[PDB]
Enzyme design. Structure first.
Site, short mmCIF file in Angstrom:
data_model
loop_
_atom_site.label_atom_id
_atom_site.label_comp_id
_atom_site.label_asym_id
_atom_site.label_seq_id
_atom_site.Cartn_x
_atom_site.Cartn_y
_atom_site.Cartn_z
N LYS A 37 73.15 63.46 16.80
CA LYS A 37 73.93 64.02 15.71
C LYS A 37 73.25 65.30 15.29
O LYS A 37 72.02 65.40 15.34
CB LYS A 37 73.94 63.05 14.51
CG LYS A 37 74.98 61.93 14.57
CD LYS A 37 74.37 60.59 14.21
CE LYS A 37 73.45 60.15 15.35
NZ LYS A 37 72.90 58.77 15.22
N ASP A 87 80.34 75.27 31.34
CA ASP A 87 81.03 74.50 30.33
C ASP A 87 81.33 75.40 29.12
O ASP A 87 81.32 74.95 27.98
CB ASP A 87 80.16 73.30 29.92
CG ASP A 87 80.99 72.09 29.39
OD1 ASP A 87 81.52 72.14 28.25
OD2 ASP A 87 81.07 71.08 30.11
#
Ligand SMILES: COc1ccc(Oc2cc(NCCC(F)(F)F)c3ncc(-c4ccc(C(=O)NC5CC5)c(C)c4)n3n2)c(F)c1F
Length: 257
Positions: free
Chosen positions: A23, A132
């Site tokens: 996170k 990406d």
């Protein structure tokens, strides 16, 4: 809610990204300053995952010198169970700042493009290929973009296969050229306001389009030609054909006035 990193203490303003076992949090230090803090949980010692993460820190560490179009990293703590990285907090990611927008100023679209290339060129010199790239991977911090990540880890997403290039779909090899393509799509979307297939929905079709020589990508007319030229050169389908980041850096579109 407190947090400790190398005995410095941090109170979380809020979570700003998540994914896998990690996170990210916006947070404040002792002296009222802001920062992001990526917190990874290694309880799940997926060993590929773990080396992917040791590799990301290593690189993120090394690219502190070669560029500040790369997110800053002030500190980190790693053990067998967790990893805390204390980083720079950007005002806003790019992916947002674009969706809250109709018209981009041409001068800003240029300055963001420069910044994009500089950062991507930097990581190629060190042999990283992102493969990406999307707007989320960039980030505004006082007018400059900065690349946030390298493609090393199975990345978060804040809180789409438009930018996927051809070579990555036939090959089931990845050169630098692969990032060019996605960069093109990001530029494309910054001029026209849609990636080059925001309008194909059948995914089986969408990837047959990404790779169909005879699908002419629609290149509108626009106020500035150079941009249009940069865009055609980036969205070619043979990598051996496609313009390079060094050619891109010596393009008229980035160099003149
Ligand atoms: C693909 O993974 C992402 C995950 C979260 C993302 O969102 C954001 C949004 C930010 N705006 C903060 C301002 C606010 F909202 F608080 F007002 C922000 N500031 C620093 C970092 C940040 C810094 C480092 C890293 C990171 O882990 N990079 C890897 C260590 C190389 C990430 C993913 C985001 N972020 N990240 C994002 F854009 C991504 F692309």
């Amino acid at each position: 809610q407190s947090m400790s990193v190398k005995g410095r203490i941090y109170s979380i303003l809020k979570q700003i990204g998540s994914g896998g076992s990690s996170k990210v949090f916006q947070v404040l230090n002792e002296k009222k300053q802001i920062y992001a803090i990526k917190y990874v949980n290694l309880e799940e010692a997926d060993n590929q995952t773990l080396d992917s993460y040791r590799n990301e820190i290593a690189y993120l560490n090394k690219l502190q010198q070669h560029s500040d179009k790369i997110i800053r990293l002030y500190d980190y703590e790693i053990t067998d169970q967790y990893i805390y990285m204390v980083m720079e907090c950007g005002n806003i990611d790019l992916n947002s700042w674009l969706k809250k927008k109709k018209s981009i100023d041409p001068w800003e679209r240029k300055s963001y493009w420069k910044n994009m290339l500089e950062a991507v060129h930097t990581i190629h010199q060190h042999g990283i290929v992102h493969s990406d790239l999307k707007p989320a991977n960039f980030l505004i911090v006082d007018g400059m973009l900065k690349l946030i990540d390298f493609g090393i880890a199975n990345q978060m997403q804040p809180d789409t296969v438009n930018y996927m290039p051809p070579e990555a779909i036939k090959d089931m090899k990845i050169s630098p050229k692969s990032d060019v393509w996605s960069l093109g799509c990001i530029l494309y979307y910054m001029t026209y306001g849609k990636t080059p297939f925001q309008q194909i929905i059948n995914q089986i079709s969408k990837l047959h389009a990404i790779i169909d020589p005879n699908h002419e990508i629609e290149f509108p007319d626009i106020p500035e030609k150079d941009l249009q030229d940069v865009l055609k050169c980036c969205l070619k389908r043979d990598p051996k054909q496609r313009i390079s980041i060094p050619e891109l850096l010596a393009h008229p579109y980035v160099q003149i006035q």
